Amino acid sequence: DHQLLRYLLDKD
Amino acid sequence: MELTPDQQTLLHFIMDSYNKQRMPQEITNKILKEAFSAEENFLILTEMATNHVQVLVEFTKKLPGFQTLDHEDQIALLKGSAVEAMFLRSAEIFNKKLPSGHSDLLEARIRNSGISDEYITPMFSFYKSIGELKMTQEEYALLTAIVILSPDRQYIKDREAVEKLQEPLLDVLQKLCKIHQPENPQHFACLLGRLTELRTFNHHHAEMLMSWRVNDHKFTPLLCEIWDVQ
Ligand SMILES: CO[C@H](c1ccccc1)c1nc2cc(F)c(F)cc2n1[C@H](C(=O)N[C@H]1CC[C@H](O)CC1)C1CCCCC1
Structure with a gap:
C-alpha cells in the first residue's frame, strides 16, 4: 500500500 | 538535425518543470558551510530526499500523457525511477562549478x-563519468524525463503506453546531442549508456542507507513508501 504517492499523484 | 516547433515547445516545457527543483547552491552551501556528524548528515539526507520525491512527483505529473496512464503503472514508474532520478540530480549538482577548492571539500x-x-566509490565514479559528458541543463532534464518514462520497469502492465510517451523525449534528446556535441557523434548513445549505470544504484539502496553510522535509521513516511525501508 502506497497512499502518500497515490495522494500526491491524485491531488489537484 | 534541427528541432521542430513542437519539439522546441516540449523542450521549453520540460525545462520550466525541471527548474522547480531546489537550486544546486542551496544543497552545496549546506554541505560546504560546516562539517556535520554522521547523525546530522543522515537527517540532512532524509530531508533532501523527501523534498526531491515531492518535486519529482510534480515534475512527473507534468510529463505529457503521464496523467492518462493506468494508475497502478503510474505508481510503478515513480517507485521504479525515484532512486535513479535522485542520483542523476546529485550527479548534476556535484558537477556544478564552484570556487577553487570547494569541489575538493564537497567530495571530502x-x-x-x-x-x-564501498558505496561511496561507485557514487563518485558515476558522478565523474557524468561530469566528463559535460551535459547541459536540457540534457539532464530530458534524461530525467526518459528515466521516469522507462517502459522496461517491474510490474508495468501496459509497456506500449509508456513507450509512446518516452519516444518524443528520446527524439528531442538525440537532436540536442547532434546540435550541442557534433564533434562527438556517440554522445546520445553515451547518455543512454549512463542510464544502465544509474540502475545499479537501485538494488543496494536500502543496504547503503542501513549502513549509515547512526543509532536509529528513521525515515519519513514518504521515503518508506517510495524506498524499500521501514
Ligand atoms: C544521493 O545522495 C548522495 C549521497 C552521498 C553520500 C551518502 C548518502 C547519499 C549525494 N551525492 C551528492 C552530491 C552532491 F554534489 C551533493 F551536494 C550532495 C550529494 N548527496 C547527498 C544529498 O544531499 N543528496 C540530495 C538528494 C536530493 C537532491 O534534490 C539534492 C541532493 C548527501 C551528501 C552528504 C551529506 C548528506 C547529503
Whole structure:
C-alpha cells in the first residue's frame, strides 16, 4: 500500500 | 538535425518543470558551510530526499500523457525511477562549478557522510563519468524525463503506453546531442549508456542507507513508501 504517492499523484 | 516547433515547445516545457527543483547552491552551501556528524548528515539526507520525491512527483505529473496512464503503472514508474532520478540530480549538482577548492571539500564532506566506503566509490565514479559528458541543463532534464518514462520497469502492465510517451523525449534528446556535441557523434548513445549505470544504484539502496553510522535509521513516511525501508 502506497497512499502518500497515490495522494500526491491524485491531488489537484 | 534541427528541432521542430513542437519539439522546441516540449523542450521549453520540460525545462520550466525541471527548474522547480531546489537550486544546486542551496544543497552545496549546506554541505560546504560546516562539517556535520554522521547523525546530522543522515537527517540532512532524509530531508533532501523527501523534498526531491515531492518535486519529482510534480515534475512527473507534468510529463505529457503521464496523467492518462493506468494508475497502478503510474505508481510503478515513480517507485521504479525515484532512486535513479535522485542520483542523476546529485550527479548534476556535484558537477556544478564552484570556487577553487570547494569541489575538493564537497567530495571530502560526501566521503565523511557516515555510510560504508564501498558505496561511496561507485557514487563518485558515476558522478565523474557524468561530469566528463559535460551535459547541459536540457540534457539532464530530458534524461530525467526518459528515466521516469522507462517502459522496461517491474510490474508495468501496459509497456506500449509508456513507450509512446518516452519516444518524443528520446527524439528531442538525440537532436540536442547532434546540435550541442557534433564533434562527438556517440554522445546520445553515451547518455543512454549512463542510464544502465544509474540502475545499479537501485538494488543496494536500502543496504547503503542501513549502513549509515547512526543509532536509529528513521525515515519519513514518504521515503518508506517510495524506498524499500521501514
Ligand atoms: C544521493 O545522495 C548522495 C549521497 C552521498 C553520500 C551518502 C548518502 C547519499 C549525494 N551525492 C551528492 C552530491 C552532491 F554534489 C551533493 F551536494 C550532495 C550529494 N548527496 C547527498 C544529498 O544531499 N543528496 C540530495 C538528494 C536530493 C537532491 O534534490 C539534492 C541532493 C548527501 C551528501 C552528504 C551529506 C548528506 C547529503
